[PDB]
């Protein structure tokens, strides 16, 4: 979603 936050490769929240 648009709320997504990608911390690093293969690791995204929301």
């Amino acid at each position, epitope marked *: 979603t*648009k*709320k*997504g*936050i*990608a*911390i*690093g*490769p293969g*690791r*995204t*929240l929301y």
Partner: antibody
Amino acid sequence: EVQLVESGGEVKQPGQSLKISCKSSGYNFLDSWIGWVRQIPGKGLEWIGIIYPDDSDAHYSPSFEGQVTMSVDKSISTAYLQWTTLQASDTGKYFCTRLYLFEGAQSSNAFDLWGQGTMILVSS
Amino acid sequence: SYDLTQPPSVSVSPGQTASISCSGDKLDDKYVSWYYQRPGQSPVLLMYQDFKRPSGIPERLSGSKSGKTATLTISGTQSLDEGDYYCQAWDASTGVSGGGTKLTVLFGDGTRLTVLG
């Protein structure tokens, strides 16, 4: 234009309450996280927290948690930072910023938009 | 959570390349972003996802990462390049008693670039 405009600088006494604002324009306010960062004159950037305007979901820095509160008023595209009781250690330039979600080959985020800052001086 | 370490200062001669490091325990698997800040002004995004430049940022500026160290490289340095540079990354973890993932924005202490003009 796409920007964040913050409220004016203020001199406050310790013990006083305070609420500063950040008005967003130029993009869909509800869909991008808003971050807050403090910078003591001559020092580095200190993260305060982030809040998602659409639902007010929030993440705070342990250093600022319970000391300040983040909120938003969706109707006027404004984000706020508020204190119940100020301390001299709250002195500093406060910036609000927008976390942009780059929808490229791989997704990633970065604070691409920054307000002009609000200087808060807490002194007796 | 992990600390991000940056050299407090970097000096370079005009036209030469300057490199600014940023080290952190989880950086090897965390995207790094870089910001520029001129005295009295607001920060400006220079790089994200380790090596990506947002629109308008010149090609002479590049970002990379090796192991737990991210590096911002400025080639063809000029006097106007002076100022502070900050690296930034994230940390994510779930509390032992639940409550969903907790996010943390991490900033390096900053590096002041000096261009010997």
